[PDB]
Amino acid sequence: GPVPSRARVYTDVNTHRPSEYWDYESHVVEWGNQDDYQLVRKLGRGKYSEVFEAINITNNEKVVVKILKPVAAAKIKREIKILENLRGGPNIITLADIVKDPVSRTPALVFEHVNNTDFKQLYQTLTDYDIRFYMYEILKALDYCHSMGIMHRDVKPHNVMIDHEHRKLRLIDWGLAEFYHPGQEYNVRVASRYFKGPELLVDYQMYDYSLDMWSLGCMLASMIFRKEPFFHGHDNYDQLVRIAKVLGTEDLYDYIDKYNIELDPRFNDILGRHSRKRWERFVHSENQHLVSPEALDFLDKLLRYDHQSRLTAREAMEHPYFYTVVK
Ligand SMILES: Nc1ncnc2c1ncn2[C@@H]1O[C@H](COP(=O)(O)OP(=O)(O)OP(=O)(O)O)[C@@H](O)[C@H]1O
Questions:
Q1: What does the record say about activity regulation?
Q2: I need a labelling partner for 149 at 20 to 30 A (CA). Which of 49, 86, 270, 314 fits?
């Protein structure tokens, strides 16, 4: 069967912390006062929650209230425990409170409010300098949560808020986040399609923190090449084909061979044969201002089939791409 895998970094974090740290079921939630928060307007609704802008009436400050749908308690406790563990970490969204919603009778997570810049606006106007600056801010959040034994598993543009005025970044939506435990087989149904790593697409369950570095690479490639999304699959199968047309099929076959993966036979008729395309093939007059040899070198080291061969967040921070960023 498949050969096991473990992260090359932060492998022991959850064993050397007490059991209370990662055993989210045993966690007893301290409940705040729901009347401290007055709902202002509905911001959105996902599959697991309804999101409201609100005012904390005890200090008159804006908050965001995420009222959870009554799906599965295990998921709820995991998100709370991860948010509390990472609280105060660099560029991690602050969980300000947990209350019982009077209407839904379900938990409602209260977060710090981010006056975020419109995402289409960020995509269309961040400069070469800003992409480097904000990518460095994302790496601070990722290295922190990975160092804390947690993988985000849903890194994508909508989960990375920026208040451009105050050059402030927050990594949000920790509902798919998980504790990394060596040898553990995880659900591959995580991350949005365009951001799914090859490990998920080939159904390799023993993945780790390095999944977040692939997703980050997808964000970077889209930004610098001006192609949204960069890997545009019609479904999860075609998603692997889109990747293969860029990275080639030979390295995909080596990856599968290395981990002794049994590739879904559905792939035999659609993968075809492709050779890696040099990154310069994606350069054109409309994206030349965001591309540099350092940007290409950095992207190359994130977008690798082999999850074990990708730069970690800490190594990524040492890359020449960030030398121009004021620290
Ligand atoms: N802490 C926060 N501060 C301000 N706005 C927030 C905060 N957390 C979430 N929001 C906003 O709440 C809205 C609704 O959240 P939701 O997750 O449903 O949206 P989304 O990111 O567009 O969804 P999807 O994950 O499908 O892309 C979004 O506009 C999101 O930016």
A1: Constitutively active protein kinase whose activity is not directly affected by phosphorylation. Seems to be regulated by level of expression and localization.
A2: 49
Burial class (CB in 10 A: 0-12, 13-18, 19+), 214: buried
Residue nearest atom 15 in ligand 1 by C-alpha distance: 44
Active site residues: 154
* C-alpha span between 266 and 36 (Å, rounded): 54
How many helical (H) and strand (E) elements, i.e. helices and strands, does the chain have? 11, 9
Residue closest to 292 by CA, chosen among 322, 326, 247: 322
**Experimental technique:** X-ray
**Helix or strand run (H / E) with residue 69:** none
Q: What is the experimental resolution, given in Å to one decimal place?
A: 1.9
Protein residue closest via CA to atom 12 of ligand 1: 43
Q: How far is ligand 1, taken at its centre, from the CA of residue 60, in Å?
A: 21
Kindly list the domain boundaries of the chain, sorted by start residue.
5-22+114-327, 23-113
Ligand 1 centroid to Cα of residue 43, in Å, is 7
Nearest CA to ligand 1 atom 11: 43
Distances (CA, A) of 87 to 83, 172, 203, 238: 6, 12, 32, 38
Q: Cα(63) to centroid of ligand 1, in Å?
A: 12
The answer to whether 54 and 65 are in contact (CB under 8 A) is yes
